[PDB]
Amino acid sequence: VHWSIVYRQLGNLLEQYEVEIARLKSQLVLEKKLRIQVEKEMESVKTKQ
Amino acid sequence: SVHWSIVYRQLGNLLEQYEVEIARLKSQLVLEKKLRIQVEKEMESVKTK
Amino acid sequence: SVHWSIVYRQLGNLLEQYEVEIARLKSQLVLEKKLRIQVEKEMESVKT
Amino acid sequence: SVHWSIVYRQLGNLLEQYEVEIARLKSQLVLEKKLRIQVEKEMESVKTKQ
């Protein structure tokens, strides 16, 4: 079957990769931000004793 | 002009780089989620001291 | 850097160009063989 | 399902084929035209002499 079909499949895969990378980075920056907030609040609470 | 194999190779390297970057970001995210879970569990312990 | 879609389109373009070029060369070769056959048959009927 | 490298390799193979086929076809077309024109010139010069 014609090369264009397979070619388009590769293009669609690149679209998925680009969006998936965006989503994973977004989630990584967020989970780290939130985690650091709790680490700091915890040290502060500890030193209030 | 530029031989077609230059373009073909660049595309190949894009596909590979994105697949690898996606695996990388996913393992980094597994680790971040574990770290966050550990920190929150310690915070709970501290707030019930 | 260059967005992946630039390279991807360049390749799709090359694939298309080559497919088109092969169709063109083939149709031209059909005509050229017909003319050659005609010419040689004519030449045989002059060398008589 | 099937890893993209498989399909990507098939495409590279198709381009290899395309390049070689184009070379071959151009070789053949150039030659056919060359020989044909040889015979046309020959036939011209001969027929004016009859």
Resolution (A): 2.2
Q: Per-domain residue ranges for chain A?
A: 1-49
Q: Which of B1, B2, B5, B10 to mutate to test the interface with C (most CBs of C within 10 A)?
A: B10
Long-range residue pairs from C39-48, CB within 8 A, at least 24 positions apart, any chain:
C39/D36, C39/D39, C39/D40, C39/D43, C40/D39, C42/D43, C43/D39, C43/D42, C43/D43, C43/D46, C46/D43, C46/D46, C46/D47, C46/D50, C47/D46
Residue C12, min C-alpha distance to chain D (Å): 10
Experimental method: X-ray
What residues have CB less than 8 Å from B12, skipping those under 6 apart?
A: D8, D12
Residue that has been written with the tokens 């169709």 in this structure: C23
* Secondary structure letter of residue C6 according to DSSP: H
Find the closest chain C residue to A5 by CA distance: C12
**Residue A32 is encoded by which pair of tokens?**
């780290």
* Secondary structure letter of residue C46 according to DSSP: T
Instruction: Determine contact, residues C14/D16, Cβ cutoff 8 Å.
Output: no
